[PDB]
Design a protein around this motif. Structure first.
Motif, PDB file in Angstrom:
ATOM      1  N   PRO A   1      23.246  64.681  46.226  1.00 11.31           N
ATOM      2  CA  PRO A   1      24.129  65.280  47.193  1.00 11.31           C
ATOM      3  C   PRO A   1      25.357  64.420  47.421  1.00 11.31           C
ATOM      4  O   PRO A   1      26.384  64.952  47.857  1.00 11.31           O
ATOM      5  N   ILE A   2      25.299  63.157  47.058  1.00  9.77           N
ATOM      6  CA  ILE A   2      26.375  62.234  47.415  1.00  9.77           C
ATOM      7  C   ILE A   2      27.563  62.364  46.483  1.00  9.77           C
ATOM      8  O   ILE A   2      28.694  62.622  46.907  1.00  9.77           O
TER       9      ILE A   2
ATOM     10  N   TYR B   1      24.920  70.168  57.078  1.00 10.30           N
ATOM     11  CA  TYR B   1      24.211  69.161  56.267  1.00 10.30           C
ATOM     12  C   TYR B   1      22.878  68.749  56.895  1.00 10.30           C
ATOM     13  O   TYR B   1      21.887  68.684  56.208  1.00 10.30           O
TER      14      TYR B   1
ATOM     15  N   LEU C   1      27.541  61.963  55.797  1.00 10.71           N
ATOM     16  CA  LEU C   1      26.560  62.224  54.742  1.00 10.71           C
ATOM     17  C   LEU C   1      25.919  60.921  54.220  1.00 10.71           C
ATOM     18  O   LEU C   1      24.722  60.933  53.888  1.00 10.71           O
TER      19      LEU C   1
ATOM     20  N   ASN D   1      29.038  65.801  46.865  1.00  5.13           N
ATOM     21  CA  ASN D   1      29.853  65.969  48.074  1.00  5.13           C
ATOM     22  C   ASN D   1      31.263  65.486  47.806  1.00  5.13           C
ATOM     23  O   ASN D   1      32.248  66.157  48.168  1.00  5.13           O
TER      24      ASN D   1
ATOM     25  N   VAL E   1      20.414  71.527  56.375  1.00  4.77           N
ATOM     26  CA  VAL E   1      20.059  71.582  54.922  1.00  4.77           C
ATOM     27  C   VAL E   1      19.109  70.409  54.536  1.00  4.77           C
ATOM     28  O   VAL E   1      18.186  70.563  53.718  1.00  4.77           O
TER      29      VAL E   1
ATOM     30  N   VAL F   1      26.362  74.376  50.584  1.00  7.20           N
ATOM     31  CA  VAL F   1      27.153  73.756  51.623  1.00  7.20           C
ATOM     32  C   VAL F   1      28.512  73.396  51.088  1.00  7.20           C
ATOM     33  O   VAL F   1      29.491  73.763  51.688  1.00  7.20           O
ATOM     34  N   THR F   2      28.595  72.675  49.974  1.00  3.16           N
ATOM     35  CA  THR F   2      29.921  72.230  49.548  1.00  3.16           C
ATOM     36  C   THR F   2      30.843  73.428  49.327  1.00  3.16           C
ATOM     37  O   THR F   2      32.030  73.384  49.742  1.00  3.16           O
TER      38      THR F   2
ATOM     39  N   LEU G   1      21.217  77.264  51.371  1.00  2.40           N
ATOM     40  CA  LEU G   1      19.871  76.840  50.989  1.00  2.40           C
ATOM     41  C   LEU G   1      19.833  75.556  50.114  1.00  2.40           C
ATOM     42  O   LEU G   1      18.765  75.127  49.668  1.00  2.40           O
ATOM     43  N   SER G   2      20.997  74.955  49.899  1.00  2.00           N
ATOM     44  CA  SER G   2      21.089  73.702  49.130  1.00  2.00           C
ATOM     45  C   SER G   2      22.404  73.020  49.442  1.00  2.00           C
ATOM     46  O   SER G   2      23.316  73.683  49.890  1.00  2.00           O
ATOM     47  N   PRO G   3      22.524  71.700  49.133  1.00  2.00           N
ATOM     48  CA  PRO G   3      23.787  70.968  49.280  1.00  2.00           C
ATOM     49  C   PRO G   3      24.969  71.599  48.454  1.00  2.00           C
ATOM     50  O   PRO G   3      26.141  71.580  48.906  1.00  2.00           O
TER      51      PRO G   3
ATOM     52  N   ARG H   1      15.676  71.404  55.732  1.00  2.00           N
ATOM     53  CA  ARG H   1      15.146  72.408  54.799  1.00  2.00           C
ATOM     54  C   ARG H   1      14.764  71.789  53.451  1.00  2.00           C
ATOM     55  O   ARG H   1      13.773  72.131  52.827  1.00  2.00           O
TER      56      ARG H   1
ATOM     57  N   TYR I   1      14.496  68.321  52.269  1.00  2.00           N
ATOM     58  CA  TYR I   1      13.735  67.086  52.180  1.00  2.00           C
ATOM     59  C   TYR I   1      12.759  66.938  53.362  1.00  2.00           C
ATOM     60  O   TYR I   1      12.059  65.949  53.414  1.00  2.00           O
TER      61      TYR I   1
ATOM     62  N   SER J   1      22.725  69.259  43.015  1.00  2.00           N
ATOM     63  CA  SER J   1      23.199  68.938  44.372  1.00  2.00           C
ATOM     64  C   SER J   1      22.033  68.364  45.172  1.00  2.00           C
ATOM     65  O   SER J   1      22.204  67.465  46.026  1.00  2.00           O
ATOM     66  N   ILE J   2      20.823  68.821  44.856  1.00  2.00           N
ATOM     67  CA  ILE J   2      19.610  68.401  45.568  1.00  2.00           C
ATOM     68  C   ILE J   2      19.218  66.965  45.239  1.00  2.00           C
ATOM     69  O   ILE J   2      18.716  66.183  46.088  1.00  2.00           O
ATOM     70  N   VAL J   3      19.457  66.627  43.980  1.00  2.00           N
ATOM     71  CA  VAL J   3      19.117  65.366  43.424  1.00  2.00           C
ATOM     72  C   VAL J   3      20.259  64.310  43.619  1.00  2.00           C
ATOM     73  O   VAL J   3      20.008  63.134  43.615  1.00  2.00           O
TER      74      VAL J   3
END
Ligand code: NAD
Ligand code: NAD
Lengths: 336, 336
Positions: free
Chosen positions: A111-112, B176, B123, A115, B179, A168-169, A163-165, B182, B184, A107-109
């Motif tokens: 997020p798009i 978002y 996003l 999402n 996040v 969130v999702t 703490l990450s995308p 946090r 990036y 998700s960090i790498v």
């Protein structure tokens, strides 16, 4: 004895229904498919084979009768497409929504795409389900949603900053589900899974979960890494507990709906103790280096499953050690 | 004296920057466009004309010089397309993201479209901005993020459950954004708008806001409808106050970022009061039925704007009556 779950499964065999499983070619989806076909359900499956595999579907074919297999209608497609979602919803009674792109680091790498898969796809399926007036709707949520909440064990009403995308999702799934109950009367169940494991969990690939990734490595005779100091700790939950909870949720009484439940066993194991249980179960059927903490990773993890126990009569019956025992034969065969 | 705001605007006249305004053809976007071109800035604009209007841009053109307008690069396109988001981000210093589908009731009828624009779209712009490493990123958030929280006036750190699919989308923008800080290091400012009004707010359509809708109805001699007993109240905020806050946020010190700010006056006006103000102001420039409460309507809304005043040096110096005085001539002209 999983008393209530037995009773609910007996209702289903006598009066079978039509189920939709999204993510059906994946780990949890294909385990759900196997149990629903064994109950003689009619099953509609949807998957895009992103992280899922045709080989999971072929494996389930060999595990059920011909008549049971004949009630499975598989649809290759994507939850991001609303038209596809509406098509597959037709005549469905019970929705089990598992399709998503999992993993915190994924998700960090990206997020798009994540999402799109996990929020857009979730909403498409949620909305098609409401419009088709399905009897029930249960979706995979996540213990990542606890975020930085420092409390142990984890209780449903008490969550932290995500703490990450990925966090969130999943959290977004839950809030849309609640808004659906309040604005449409459409009552759902979200299941916060904790660290599920068992047969057909993918061991290959950069996002593999710790149990199958280590199992593979010990079978290869490869190095077994440990992201951080190894004291990071988890509520590992064998897949059968998850199957129980999906099925209890789909047939829950109405006042138990529009709720989130932890799905786990309530125990805690450290990265360091797990290593040894895995060696021992594997070593029983005839066959370690430290490094940097992983980014956006939750530190410490144990569920309080009181709420599922009380409201749904969940009875988790399979704990870490036995799940491993039950799981290792599958890994040997798949990897040999 | 709007004094930090005066200092900032004087500085921009001396040292132009490149701004991206999404939603530039809409109410708040075209008002930002007007202010920025008059400050001789370079502005990249993006809009799909879904609820915005080409006549809004034609109007801004007639209010600025040829040389100022020549600094406006306008792109017709859609924030749901990532490529488009990346393209318009190029060279950009300050992002003012206003593009969204507003309206609670629109979102109830069509939660899918509202999600795609307000979450996916948001996003895409947040991500492209992070990748482009812009100096600042400011986005249009909403007082609907308070949800069922009972505090009044509304204070930024205390929020409740979201009450419509719209509110979900605007809350998710904030999550978002936090996040992204946090994970990036990309620190943004979210602006919780309260009932903004002024020139170029659309009086037409099922979802027109109360001030332009009533203004138009009195100019036509149409029935002015009050939804409920008219004791319902809001913190109606003239556009220039919102322009102010957008510019204060684009240029905020780093410590003031990764923060949400209410944008409003701090006052409460009843629907009954308002209908009298509107009539009085219009009839100075020269020219009512009760019915059911709108269903699922907030009763009272008022912002505490202390945080904006302390941390951004905001001055809410245009109150409702002066705002109506300033807006009424534009409606008269627009509808005659
Ligand atoms: N396994 C765990 O420990 C765990 C933990 C937390 C949450 N979850 C959630 O459980 C669910 C099931 O996960 P899993 O572990 O079985 O992972 P998995 O990757 O095996 O299963 C996901 C399935 O969904 C399908 N899919 C993905 N995106 C899709 C799309 N856009 N359209 C159609 N199909 C799509 C994939 O092809 C795959 O078959 C997911 O929602 C996951 O987020 C699992
Ligand atoms: N007006 C209010 O009181 C109020 C209150 C709360 C929040 N807001 C927020 O402020 C922002 C501006 O709202 P507004 O009142 O000017 O509304 P508006 O409809 O007048 O302006 C929005 C603009 O966004 C454009 N747009 C929408 N979807 C798009 C997409 N996918 N791609 C490109 N362009 C798109 C529209 O065409 C329009 O020009 C929005 O984020 C709105 O939600 C306004």
């Amino acid at each position: 004895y999983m008393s209530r779950y037995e009773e609910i499964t007996q209702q289903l065999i006598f009066s079978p229904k039509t189920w939709l499983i999204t993510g059906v070619a994946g780990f949890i989806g294909s385990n759900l498919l196997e149990k629903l076909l064994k109950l003689n359900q009619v099953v509609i499956g949807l998957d895009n084979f992103s992280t899922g595999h045709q080989y999971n579907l072929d494996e389930v074919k060999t595990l059920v009768s011909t008549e049971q297999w004949s009630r499975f209608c598989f649809i290759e497609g994507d939850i991001r497409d609303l038209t596809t979602c509406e098509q597959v919803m037709k005549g469905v009674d019970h929705v089990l929504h598992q399709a998503a792109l999992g993993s915190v680091p994924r998700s960090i790498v990206d997020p798009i795409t994540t999402n799109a898969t996990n929020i857009t796809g979730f909403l498409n399926i949620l909305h098609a389900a409401k419009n088709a007036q399905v009897q029930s709707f249960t979706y995979a949520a996540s213990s990542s949603t606890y975020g930085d909440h420092p409390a142990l064990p984890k209780v449903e009403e008490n969550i932290g900053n995500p703490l990450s995308p990925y966090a969130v999702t999943k959290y977004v799934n839950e809030i849309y589900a609640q808004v659906y109950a309040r604005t449409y009367g459409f009552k759902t169940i979200g299941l916060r899974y904790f660290n599920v494991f068992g047969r057909r969990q993918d061991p290959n690939g950069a996002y593999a979960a710790v149990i199958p990734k280590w199992t593979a490595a010990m079978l290869k005779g490869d190095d077994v890494y440990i992201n951080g100091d190894g004291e990071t700790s988890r509520d590992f939950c064998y897949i059968d507990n998850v199957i129980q909870m999906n099925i209890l949720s789909a047939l829950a009484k109405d006042s138990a709906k529009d709720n989130i439940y932890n799905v786990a066993v309530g125990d805690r194991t450290t990265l360091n103790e797990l290593s040894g249980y895995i060696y021992d179960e594997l070593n029983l059927i005839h066959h370690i280096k430290y490094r940097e903490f992983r980014s956006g990773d939750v530190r410490h993890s144990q569920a309080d499953v009181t709420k599922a126990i009380d409201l749904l009569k969940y009875r988790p019956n399979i704990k870490i050690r036995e799940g491993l025992r039950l799981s290792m034969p599958w890994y040997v065969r798949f990897l040999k």
